[PDB]
Amino acid sequence: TXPGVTXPGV
Amino acid sequence: XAXVXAXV
DNA sequence: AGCTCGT
DNA sequence: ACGCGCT
Ligand SMILES: *C(=O)c1cnc2ccccc2n1
Ligand SMILES: *C(=O)c1cnc2ccccc2n1
Ligand SMILES: [Mg+2]
Ligand SMILES: [Mg+2]
Numbered sequence: 001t002x003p004g005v006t007x008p009g010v
Numbered sequence: 011x012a013x014v015x016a017x018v
Numbered sequence: 019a020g021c022t023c024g025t
Numbered sequence: 026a027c028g029c030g031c032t
């Protein structure tokens with residue numbers, strides 16, 4: 001996720 | 011990712 | 019494949 | 026002294 005907590009996605 | 015001082 | 023902080 | 030969350 002995020003970043004943080006990429007995306008999703010990418 | 012860990013949160014032990016920052017928690018990002 | 020795709021990234022990030024200091025208490 | 027610590028690595029995290031789905032599309
Ligand atoms: C979270 O797992 C995590 C891991 N490494 C990092 C390095 C620098 C800043 C934040 C970070 N977070
Ligand atoms: C939290 O601020 C923090 C700062 N320095 C660290 C060094 C090593 C592990 C965890 C740490 N946490
Ligand atoms: Mg993969
Ligand atoms: Mg540091």
Ligand SMILES: [Mg+2]
Nearest residue numbers: 011012027028
């Ligand atoms: Mg590390």
Ligand SMILES: [Mg+2]
Nearest residue numbers: 011028029030
């Ligand atoms: Mg994991």
